[PDB]
Amino acid sequence: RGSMKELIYIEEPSILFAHGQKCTDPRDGLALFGPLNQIYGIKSGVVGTQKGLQIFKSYLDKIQKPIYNHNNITRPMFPGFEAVFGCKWESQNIVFKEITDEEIRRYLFNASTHKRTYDLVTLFNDKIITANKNDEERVDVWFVIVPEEIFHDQLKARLLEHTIPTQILRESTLAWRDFKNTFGAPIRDFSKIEGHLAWTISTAAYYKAGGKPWKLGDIRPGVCYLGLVYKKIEKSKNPQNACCAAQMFLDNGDGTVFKGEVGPWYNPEKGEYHLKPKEAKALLTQALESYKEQNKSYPKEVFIHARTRFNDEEWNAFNEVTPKNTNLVGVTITKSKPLKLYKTEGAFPIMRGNAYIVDEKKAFLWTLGFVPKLQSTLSMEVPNPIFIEINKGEAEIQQVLKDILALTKLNYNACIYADGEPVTLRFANKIGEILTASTEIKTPPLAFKYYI
């Protein structure tokens, strides 16, 4: 035991649902509790083929009825969107919109994809814009259905300019029955995922319709979490092109995203992954003011989260804008470095939440592992811990991992138990992906209902 080393344990964070009560499992407690922000009715709109709408409505009237899972212990039941979320979602109320089949034959005829993708998106974007441009009956969220792959940033970026929430739906995910390979098996093989497939789309659709399924129930005041990620795009033929991103959450309401600038850095071939001091400090002042106005309170601590190490001069620019006691911590997470642990006795992998502290700055966090309540491990293989190291700034190490576990529960796209990485970075990946379709696209909305 003398040479034995200790893994500290972080208590599982929890989230509070409607009526003020608090629970740990997001989807399990939600049915018993209800969404944090109830939404009265949801009506959507669909663009695509006639068979798409028939497939779309065939899915909608299916998910309202209770749907179970093959392994109900691993994936709990979904009694229905009307009961779980306390809302009402019909099919005949849904706004129906059509695209002529010959239009698909009109522009899919060209086998070239580089010219087709940008222009085929224009047909998708323009008709939706003409729909909710003067109609009194405004549609909450538009469900785009795609027949075949034969696109995300290309479509979302223009739609982003008009503050319209949309959710893309590949035809396979709703018609995997008929969709079969040469062996007759489904392309996506949705035999077991059924019961959980409805869970993630319903949470997504409810979120896009203005609802907030849950929020962190164990958050101290005065702190804010900011995620910065680096993305390089090949759309620009010029080698000097590498974008960045920045996210805010406010930890109590809808998130906030500010690009600051597209930022054509040096980028000798594709990028360097380092904010220049001019842009870095400019975004931070433009970042804190969002928290200052949202909570009408002076911020105290900001946890800048990234996947890369910060240099020295960028922190000096960072540190020269925060007033008084505002201290910045550089919590850079990395997934590459492996320290795969094995349970000596027994067959299950290391349970999640355990951490290995190598010093006062760096630590190994098992955001993925074995969770007892679900009686299963979310990591199919032996879990890979994420290296968490405090790149800059002085802060308690143990406090950092405590909130990272909490931050991994705030993923509204899917209703998973926890994310492998904190959502302050996972959402940032979806942030920079969308906005890089066109360089001149600006005036970006803060809401996270769209953008994903």
Added chain:
Amino acid sequence: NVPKKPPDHSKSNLLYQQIFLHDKQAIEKEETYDSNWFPIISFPNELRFHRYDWRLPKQFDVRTLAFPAIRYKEYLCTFAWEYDFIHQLPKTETYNGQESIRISTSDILSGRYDTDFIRNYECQRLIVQLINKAFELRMKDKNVREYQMSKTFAYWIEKGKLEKDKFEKIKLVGKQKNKYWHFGISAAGKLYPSPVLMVSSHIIFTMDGINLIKSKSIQHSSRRKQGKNWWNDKWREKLLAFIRFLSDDQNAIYLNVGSEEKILISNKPLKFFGKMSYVTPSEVTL
């Protein structure tokens, strides 16, 4: 009858925590974990830079050296003696030992040592390079076949050489459908958290166990096939058995770098244990 009562969902919290959460939590008893980290129990007492001038050609391939050596500002990074490079290139006999600069391993590892012509971080990198390179020069003598991955150089055991195991019937080689699957490890070592050596687990596929499969799409696709049902014990044993097989002695692994001096890599992985953990033995089939 007539269920008229305030809801008080906080009561439902108690039922939720005692009906479907019966003895299902994270704080029950102690546990011990076997890591993927293999400590380096002994380092060679000396790290030397050699001053081979006009004795090795500038166009010579240093990777062809009998012992792991690295060129560095017309100096040779190796633990081996200055006279262990006779067969690879002659004319090296005109070299005096006192010309070479000798650097102790203890300070170069603890970070104490630092000079003008070399720094700690680059010194740590060179040691990382040397022990990483020493594996290639050792796997030839250990009777295993290699395989180049995207970055690493994985090694596996040829089919039928052993009795499909090393100890306790731990299957290290086998076949699925008409293809053969073979457990393989990787090499990696670094010194910052502690002097230790990393290994990684990959399964290498061959059409019969000898004639490899060049189509990387088949190799990757088959890789996910075999691991989809592997247990945690399966990954633990197939790695422990593989390392134990590669070790030539029950003590540790001898990484020959010098004529007689070498590097000792403990076959027992660095050990971890936690104070409180899970309890669940439930399993039926899949």
Added chain:
DNA sequence: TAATAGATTAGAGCCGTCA
């Protein structure tokens, strides 16, 4: 100006749907 590497990164396919 490309080689050798280590360290540190980002995309881009493919696969699995968890005891």
Added chain:
RNA sequence: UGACGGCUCUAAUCUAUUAG
């Protein structure tokens, strides 16, 4: 483009380093 993760396969780049 319901997600997640865990894999291989590429791809920069930044550090000593020798030849330009």
